[PDB]
Amino acid sequence: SMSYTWTGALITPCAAEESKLMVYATTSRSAGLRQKKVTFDRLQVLDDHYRDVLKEMKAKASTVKAKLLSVEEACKLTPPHSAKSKFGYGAKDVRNLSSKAVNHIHSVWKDLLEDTVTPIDTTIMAKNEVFCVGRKPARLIVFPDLGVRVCEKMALYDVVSTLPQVVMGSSYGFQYSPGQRVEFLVNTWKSKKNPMGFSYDTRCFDSTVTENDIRVEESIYQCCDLAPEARQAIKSLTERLYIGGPLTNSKGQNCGYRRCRASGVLTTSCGNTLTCYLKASAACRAAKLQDCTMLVNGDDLVVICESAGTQEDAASLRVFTEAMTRYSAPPGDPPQPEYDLELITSCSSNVSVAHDASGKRVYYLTRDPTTPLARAAWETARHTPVNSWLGNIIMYAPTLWARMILMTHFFSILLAQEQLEKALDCQIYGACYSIEPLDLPQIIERLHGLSAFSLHSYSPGEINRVASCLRKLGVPPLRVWRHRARSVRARLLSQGGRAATCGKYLFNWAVK
Ligand SMILES: CN1CCC[C@@H](CN(C)C(=O)Cn2c(-c3ccccc3)c(C3CCCCC3)c3ccc(C(=O)O)cc32)C1
Ligand SMILES: [Mn+2]
Ligand SMILES: [Mn+2]
């Protein structure tokens, strides 16, 4: 059946958008191009590999016990900036246990227990994301009302935060920090006698997810030891929200129908991950890949295995891709075999090497600096909820490009404007922090270790990538950034106390 049906009505904005300040942002104006790409008929033929894998997943999920969150708990874990409800309350009311929000949530819950059929309304919107130079359309976000989003947490928060790591073990990508991800990948690579690996990424993964996939996910969740009420709500949520439902735009008009994965529900990330893991493990078996190890974050997959030779590997990946296509998930680009860990890119990121103070080799996670640089450029002009600059400084703090350019530029703009002690909002790992720039040294030490302030002798490929990137975007080269940073460091050190600590740790690399 069709991933989507459309009525004719447009996907409309809810606010003042802006598609430029080179660097652009996606808007609702481009939503029609996205609608085209994500609209198609799915075909799926399962086989005994798929079935054998699923059976093993269920046997693991059957050892998981999960509880209901109370309304109260679910209210307290609602994110502070999520969309206000149609029925008269917002995120802030939910979190402060307003009687209006609580009585309406209890009523949504009771309706889920009592009605297991009526499709549930979702709003469709175009996501506003900054990119770099061609132009890609806006991604679509599809979410139900806030009261339903609280009930999803009641039914499933304990399941989605416990089950996946038990079912997928070390392949569950979301349990790792960047350093931990690197350690998994490097250890896996070094365990093979002749390592080969590849990344796979599915072409419109949300749209490839079928009704059967979503029902299979529910059946995994029902292997858990759950309270009766939980089982009924999870079934009712599966039938009324997860498999499909109607879409309505920001102006309350009927946009169409969805018969595929919603991007804006609690189970999206866990479901996608479980479903990809299931099809990818089955596809490794069809392909007959030797000593296979997988890392999965949504539909981003790395596989690392024993090479069987050059032409053998190339053919084996074709058989893998064929199997994945039969299971409903063709790739955006065909996967390529790699014999260098550094060349495998997934979740937009890759492993690279540098040296610590003692001269020990140290592996760290990096990425192409183009999009992060563009995004930080945008937040120099405008101002966001997410502060992607700061998040990137935190997650990629050991990288050459974050230390030399991102850290430098932003502590300079902060000295200039005297905003050192002003806290900034910052979305990292699905949660919104209030970050004080002088807190960074401690945050980076906690996330990456002290070696992050001390790494040198980076790999020549990484240095050249940063350098080509600066040149392509019009930003000063690295010699300029070393000079500026000597200046920024000097100032911070004059300011004493905590700002002196920033200068000492964050810019120790600039000293002569
Ligand atoms: C004539 N030339 C210099 C003045 C204005 C400039 C406009 N451009 C292309 C930029 O500003 C590019 N750019 C950009 C930039 C612009 C667009 C996309 C990506 C980076 C940045 C970002 C780098 C990372 C921190 C955030 C600013 C930037 C920083 C400093 C400087 C600088 O010249 O000192 C330039 C930077 C063009
Ligand atoms: Mn994809
Ligand atoms: Mn992906």
UniProtKB/Swiss-Prot annotation:
Compartments where found: Host cytoplasm; Host endoplasmic reticulum membrane
Binding positions (Mg(2+) 2): 201, 299-300
PTM notes: The N-terminus is phosphorylated by host PRK2/PKN2.
Regulation: Activity is up-regulated by PRK2/PKN2-mediated phosphorylation.
Membrane topology listed for this record: Single-pass type IV membrane protein
Assembly behavior: Homooligomer. Interacts with non-structural protein 5A. Interacts with host VAPB. Interacts with host PRK2/PKN2. Interacts with host HNRNPA1 and SEPT6; these interactions facilitate the viral replication. Part of the replication complex composed of NS2, NS3, NS4A, NS4B, NS5A and the RNA-directed RNA polymerase embedded in an ER-derived membranous web.
The RdRp catalytic domain, residue ranges: 195-313
Effect of residue 272 to K: Complete loss of RdRp activity
Record field: catalytic activity: RNA(n) + a ribonucleoside 5'-triphosphate = RNA(n+1) + diphosphate
Protein name, entry field: RNA-directed RNA polymerase
Phosphoserine: residues bearing it: 28
Effect on the protein upon substituting residue 300 to H: Complete loss of RdRp activity
Role summary: RNA-dependent RNA polymerase that performs primer-template recognition and RNA synthesis during viral replication. Initiates RNA transcription/replication at a flavin adenine dinucleotide (FAD), resulting in a 5'- FAD cap on viral RNAs. In this way, recognition of viral 5' RNA by host pattern recognition receptors can be bypassed, thereby evading activation of antiviral pathways.
Cofactors (names): Mg(2+)
Cofactor note: Binds 2 magnesium ion that constitute a dinuclear catalytic metal center.
